[PDB]
């Protein structure tokens, strides 16, 4: 619900979630940061099985939900591993409950964390960002959306999560783009 509560609840999830074998998956993903990875990829269905309220909040209030998850990673690093100097670690959510085709993206998807399937038709770089043009896959027929990431090459089929942002496109319009939270 509120920010402080979400942080505490993410820390509990990271510490206490276990897979079908009783293994604390997210403890391992945290120790991967001490060798290193600079993200923790979180399976949303793991989160939903543990804390369905928190998982719903990630979808409906992504800016706050993602930020809280990141602050929880820092808390666990400090308290459980005595590390405070790893720097910013991104929380990257995948396996959301609904998947959109690019053509399905609408007004109802603003201000949410969304999951989109497509085929990559372009990949570019304008430092420090990577960009992807994500188009409807031919076997679903095309519309496209550009994604910005801070993994995939032209021709690759992908599933991405992210939040809709805009770019001023020069008649000028604010074209919807996706700020990418996770891609595979």
Author numbering: 1 to 35, 38 to 130, 182 to 194, 200 to 208, 214 to 233, 237 to 250
Task: Reproduce passages from the article.
The Minichromosome Maintenance (MCM) complex forms an essential hexameric-ring helicase that unwinds DNA at the replication fork (1–3). MCM proteins have three conserved domains: an N-terminal domain (MCMN) that mediates the head-to-head interaction of the initial double-hexamer; a conserved AAA+ ATPase domain; and a short helix-turn-helix domain at the C-terminus. Crystal structures of the N-terminal domains of Methanobacterium thermautotrophicus (MtMCMN), Sulfolobus solfataricus (SsoMCMN) and Pyrococcus furiosis (PfMCMN) show a consistent hexameric ring structure with three subdomains: a helical subdomain-A, a Zn-binding subdomain-B and an OB-fold subdomain-C. The crystal structure of PfMCMN bound to single-stranded DNA (ssDNA) revealed that subdomain-C binds ssDNA in the plane of the hexameric ring via conserved residues defined as the MCM single-stranded DNA-binding motif (MSSB).
